[PDB]
Amino acid sequence: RQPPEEVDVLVVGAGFSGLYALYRLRELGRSVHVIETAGDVGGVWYWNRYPGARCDIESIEYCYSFSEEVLQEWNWTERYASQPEILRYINFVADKFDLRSGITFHTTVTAAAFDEATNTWTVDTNHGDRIRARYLIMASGQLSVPQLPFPGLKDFAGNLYHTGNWPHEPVDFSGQRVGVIGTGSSGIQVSPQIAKQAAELFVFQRTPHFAVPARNAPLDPEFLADLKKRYAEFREESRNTPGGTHRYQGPKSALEVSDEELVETLERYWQEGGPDILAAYRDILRDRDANERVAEFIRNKIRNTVRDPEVAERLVPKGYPFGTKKLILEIDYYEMFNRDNVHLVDTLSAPIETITPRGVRTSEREYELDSLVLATGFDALTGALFKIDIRGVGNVALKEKWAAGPRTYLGLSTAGFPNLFFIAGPGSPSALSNMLVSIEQHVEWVTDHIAYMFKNGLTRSEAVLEKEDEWVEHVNEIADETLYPMTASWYTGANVPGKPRVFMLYVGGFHRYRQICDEVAAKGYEGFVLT
Numbered sequence: 423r424q425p426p427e428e429v430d431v432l433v434v435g436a437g438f439s440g441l442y443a444l445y446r447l448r449e450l451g452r453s454v455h456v457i458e459t460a461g462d463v464g465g466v467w468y469w470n471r472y473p474g475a476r477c478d479i480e481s482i483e484y485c486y487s488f489s490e491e492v493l494q495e496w497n498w499t500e501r502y503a504s505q506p507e508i509l510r511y512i513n514f515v516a517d518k519f520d521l522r523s524g525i526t527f528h529t530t531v532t533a534a535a536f537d538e539a540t541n542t543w544t545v546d547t548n549h550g551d552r553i554r555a556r557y558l559i560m561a562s563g564q565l566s567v568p569q570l571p572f573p574g575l576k577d578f579a580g581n582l583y584h585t586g587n588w589p590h591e592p593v594d595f596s597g598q599r600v601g602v603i604g605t606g607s608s609g610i611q612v613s614p615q616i617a618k619q620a621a622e623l624f625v626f627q628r629t630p631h632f633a634v635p636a637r638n639a640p641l642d643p644e645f646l647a648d649l650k651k652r653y654a655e656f657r658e659e660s661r662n663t664p665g666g667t668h669r670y671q672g673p674k675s676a677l678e679v680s681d682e683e684l685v686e687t688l689e690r691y692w693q694e695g696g697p698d699i700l701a702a703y704r705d706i707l708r709d710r711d712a713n714e715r716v717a718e719f720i721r722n723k724i725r726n727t728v729r730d731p732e733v734a735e736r737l738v739p740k741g742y743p744f745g746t747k748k749l750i751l752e753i754d755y756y757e758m759f760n761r762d763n764v765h766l767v768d769t770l771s772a773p774i775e776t777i778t779p780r781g782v783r784t785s786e787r788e789y790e791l792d793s794l795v796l797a798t799g800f801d802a803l804t805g806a807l808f809k810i811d812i813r814g815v816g817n818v819a820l821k822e823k824w825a826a827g828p829r830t831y832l833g834l835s836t837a838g839f840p841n842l843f844f845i846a847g848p849g850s851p852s853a854l855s856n857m858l859v860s861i862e863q864h865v866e867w868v869t870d871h872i873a874y875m876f877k878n879g880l881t882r883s884e885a886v887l888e889k890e891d892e893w894v895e896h897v898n899e900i901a902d903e904t905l906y907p908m909t910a911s912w913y914t915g916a917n918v919p920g921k922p923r924v925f926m927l928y929v930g931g932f933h934r935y936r937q938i939c940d941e942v943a944a945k946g947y948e949g950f951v952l953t
């Protein structure tokens with residue numbers, strides 16, 4: 423295509439966030455355009471084409487709600503949508519609303535500066551494009567910059583993959599000795615798929631993550647047709663929860679119940695499948711003794727599923743509270759370790775020294791491999807922004823304002839960078855809820871804000887320093903009543919060497935955050951200085 427020279431709003435990213443922003447700003451009567459590195463729309467579901475890639479929120483929850491047409495027409499097929507289906511869904515939405523005409527593909531934003539003279543952003547690309555825009559909306563994702571973990575890497579003679587940059591043609595592992603590094607949810611999803619083709623699968627686990635069974639199933643078309651009659655009502659229920667989904671909020675303490683009640687209640691969640699067990703009790707994420715009561719139950723289920731108790735014990739998560747890393751939904755992951763051709767390489771015990779040209783050496787031995795898959799995650803939440811040279815007032819780099827951790831007012835803007843907005847990022851609920859609920863709310867609040875600026879004749883919107891300071895403090899304070907900050911997770915930035923350890927997300931629940939945001943808007947955007 424080709425980016426316009428001037429535009430009311432420039433949006434970066436064509437995944438869920440950017441698509442909705444483009445749609446809604448058009449509907450608001452604004453000129454808007456999108457720059458996207460990828461060859462086409464989808465964002466994470468464009469990039470994460472590893473086999474077994476699948477959402478952990480139910481298909482009926484994980485979808486747009488802005489368009490009645492879309493809710494009535496689209497049919498989901500399974501409890502949880504695999505990546506191809508979600509990508510087909512996003513394509514369907516792009517077509518329906520003709521979004522591709524406002525998007526330049528194959529183009530990476532590399533810099534952006536705020537010009538105080540004009541109250542506009544100047545944005546440059548890796549193609550030479552230079553765009554002038556009143557407002558800049560960063561919809562560049564939360565888990566969109568692959569993290570490659572390092573000594574022997576470029577030496578590897580075989581094929582090298584990262585799950586977050588998977589080839590667009592399916593990949594044949596038939597006959598191969600294959601290694602996976604990462605047992606986060608990417609590796610836990612990709613591994614049983616690989617184990618079916620490979621002669622030998624080596625799973626390189628470091629800290630074992632908690633996974634519970636997904637128990638995927640066909641989605642009954644009769645249930646779907648029924649749900650469609652009440653869909654807006656149903657999504658509205660989802661928006662009035664902490665997590666953006668129909669999870670039941672267990673009112674009891676995990677400490678108050680008897681042993682027999684605990685086992686029974688949790689057994690029920692384990693048979694049902696899904697992530698809801700995370701809210702079986704109100705204090706699982708607040709109190710270390712409540713947490714441990716749940717964690718031990720799960721731990722015993724793991725020892726149950728694997729026949730060799732030596733391998734079994736190696737898969738049991740230790741050292742950190744259940745649910746403080748992302749909780750993972752597994753499909754046949756544990757059962758896979760009972761196969762003859764799958765070997766758990768415990769690297770807490772025998773750390774990876776180096777990659778060789780033949781494979782991977784740990785302290786203990788060398789494993790030869792034809793293919794190596796990195797399921798090693800992402801430079802989360804800040805990674806995409808930090809890959810861009812972004813400059814605010816007095817030429818402050820964002821990289822510098824945020825060097826000790828991200829600093830925002832509501833997660834939506836940062837002081838000294840006016841007219842710039844982050845969609846579903848640090849300082850807001852983000853990945854702690856159903857992201858379609860997080861993303862829709864932010865797109866609507868930001869684009870309402872833009873509309874309100876234009877109608878009132880204003881051209882400059884900035885967060886007030888002391889409000890940002892109060893916001894950061896409040897985020898840290900509420901985070902500090904949970905067990906989240908106790909643990910090294912991507913939420914904490916802890917998977918990136920050198921990255922400052924700070925819990926980056928709002929933990930007070932989607933619903934409360936949204937109230938705070940509405941109260942702000944209704945007061946003429948309190949905490950913002952508009953001129």
Ligand SMILES: Cc1cc2nc3c(=O)[nH]c(=O)nc-3n(C[C@H](O)[C@H](O)[C@H](O)COP(=O)(O)OP(=O)(O)OC[C@H]3O[C@@H](n4cnc5c(N)ncnc54)[C@H](O)[C@@H]3O)c2cc1C
Nearest residue numbers: 435437438439458459465466478479530531562563566857
């Ligand atoms: C594999 C995977 C599975 C997921 N499963 C769940 C799920 O179970 N539940 C859920 O709630 N969330 C899920 N997510 C989280 C996911 O981030 C959100 O649900 C949502 O897809 C993100 O939407 P987005 O548009 O904000 O970001 P993205 O989908 O990441 O889109 C951002 C786009 O911007 C592009 N971009 C970045 N920087 C630049 C730049 N410099 N110039 C041009 N383009 C740029 C990126 O290439 C990307 O295409 C999962 C994430 C991953 C990685």
Ligand SMILES: NC(=O)c1ccc[n+]([C@@H]2O[C@H](COP(=O)([O-])OP(=O)(O)OC[C@H]3O[C@@H](n4cnc5c(N)ncnc54)[C@H](OP(=O)(O)O)[C@@H]3O)[C@@H](O)[C@H]2O)c1
Nearest residue numbers: 476477478571604605606607608609628629748797798799
């Ligand atoms: N179905 C889904 O919902 C789904 C699927 C995929 C992704 N996601 C989203 O994206 C996030 C990322 O998931 P992910 O699995 O890609 O990444 P991750 O959760 O960031 O897991 C990275 C994995 O790689 C390991 N690792 C990283 N660096 C390493 C190193 N230098 N040496 C050895 N091991 C290393 C980590 O070990 P340690 O744990 O010990 O650090 C962990 O096993 C998820 O938590 C979730 O938010 C969701």
